[PDB]
Amino acid sequence: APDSVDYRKKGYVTPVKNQGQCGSCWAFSSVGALEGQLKKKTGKLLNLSPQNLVDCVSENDGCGGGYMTNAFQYVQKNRGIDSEDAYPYVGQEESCMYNPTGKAAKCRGYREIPEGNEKALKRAVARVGPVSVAIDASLTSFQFYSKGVYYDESCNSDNLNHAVLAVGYGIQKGNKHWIIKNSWGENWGNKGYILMARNKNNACGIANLASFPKM
Ligand SMILES: *C(=O)[C@@H](NC(=O)OC(C)(C)C)C1CCCCC1
């Protein structure tokens, strides 16, 4: 039987979130990866705080964009990241208000998958769990997605502009794919998710900026 995994079935994925009017996709991607590792390492997870990252990761630009590795590094140096409940998302950057009392996860580093390698990415998803990735999500066809395995030849792998989360991989109707968790609400795509073409020459640059935190 062909290799495939869907971490949503295993309880490694929390409900789909909505960024609102803030370019915080990176924060949600990071938090999603941390959540997956919490489930993996401790047997249970909870919603982590993307707001904590938006406000405290000085190396990023808050609602103006950021990198997942920068967030992981921050969680590590900071000795922690608050839970969503302790540090709720307001969708706008504010002053860093982290509080150790509400710490909900820790990080011991991170690893970046070899750029452009879907085979290494697949191994990471299979051996680590959900991984943070970035893609070109500017196409109109990406935005109005609803079903099937998305693939658009004009998707620019050299223009990563949206962080997302690879929650698994498989095949649907002879079409190999990556299971992708977005942060545009459950209203977007298929209940907040999108099936993206796998092994279609790094479509949309799916393997160009992938990483996972070490816990
Ligand atoms: C989306 O939420 C943001 N994307 C982002 O941080 O992209 C990386 C650096 C490729 C992960 C941006 C922030 C504002 C401009 C548009 C989308």
| CATH of residue 96 | 3.90.70.10
How many domains does the structure of the chain reveal? 1
Q: 64 CA distance to ligand 1 centroid (A)?
A: 7
- Give dist(CA 25, CA 77) in Å, integer: 22
* Domain, as residue range, for 59: 1-215
CA 39 to chain centre: 15
Structure solved via? X-ray
- Give dist(CA 117, CA 131) in Å, integer: 14
Question: What resolution does the deposited structure have, in angstroms?
Answer: 2.1
- Give dist(CA 134, CA 137) in Å, integer: 9
Burial of 21 (0-12, 13-18, 19+ CB in 10 A): exposed
Residue in 52, 60, 78, 182 annotated catalytic: 182
Residue nearest to atom 1 of ligand 1 (CA): 23
The amino acid sitting at 81 is I
